[PDB]
Write a protein that binds this ligand. Structure first.
Ligand SMILES: CCNC(=O)c1cc2c(N[C@H](c3ccc4c(c3)S(=O)(=O)CCC4)C3CC3)ncnc2[nH]1
Length: 168
């Protein structure tokens, strides 16, 4: 477990790689994989959809049962559930969707959830269709997370732009 390889070291506790989070979870077998979730845990597309399809829908079925009894999460909040075949646990974290008018300040709260786990495999929160500035999301991660985080960014151009910007 936690056999991470090929990552660029940004800080003593933040690492980054141009990779698909699904393929990283299969090779690494991490203790925790982070899902970029929405408050009702509907894993239809993007990172959430990719993780769910890689569990052959077991993640969505588990999430629907959680929602039925507990209700939706809050933006900036999180929920630990099974990681199924991809990891021991899945930490479902809700980052702000700035394309839907949600507060970017809550991105700090979203990353604070990582501090409860010694090591995690994660996507860059609120990137993609959530519309947050990816350079800013990396800065919030670096300034907030104290535990070991391995960021998988599935876009070579975005990866190159983030590394170049961080090295300034
Ligand atoms: C082939 C199956 N895998 C995938 O489709 C996949 C997609 C993917 C990925 N996408 C990034 C990303 C990061 C955060 C968020 C999104 C998307 S979202 O559009 O889902 C909205 C929620 C926040 C994207 C490059 C910035 N990052 C790592 N591993 C991946 N794997």
């Amino acid at each position: 477990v936690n056999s991470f390889s090929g990552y660029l070291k940004l800080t003593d506790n933040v690492y980054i790689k141009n990779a698909d989070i699904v393929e990283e979870a299969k090779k690494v077998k991490p203790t925790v994989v982070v899902n970029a979730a929405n408050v009702y845990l509907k894993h239809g597309g993007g990172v959430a959809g990719a993780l769910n399809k890689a569990t052959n829908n077991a993640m969505q079925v588990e999430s629907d049962d959680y929602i039925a009894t507990n209700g939706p999460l809050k933006v900036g909040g999180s929920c630990v559930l099974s990681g199924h075949n991809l990891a021991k646990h899945c930490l479902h974290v809700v980052g702000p969707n700035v394309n839907k008018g949600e507060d970017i300040q809550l991105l700090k709260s979203a990353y604070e959830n990582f501090n409860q786990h010694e090591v995690l495999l994660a996507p860059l929160l609120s990137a993609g269709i959530f519309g947050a500035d990816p350079i800013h999301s990396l800065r919030v991660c670096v300034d907030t997370v104290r535990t070991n985080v391995y960021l998988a960014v599935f876009d070579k151009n975005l990866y190159d732009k983030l590394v170049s910007s961080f090295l300034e």
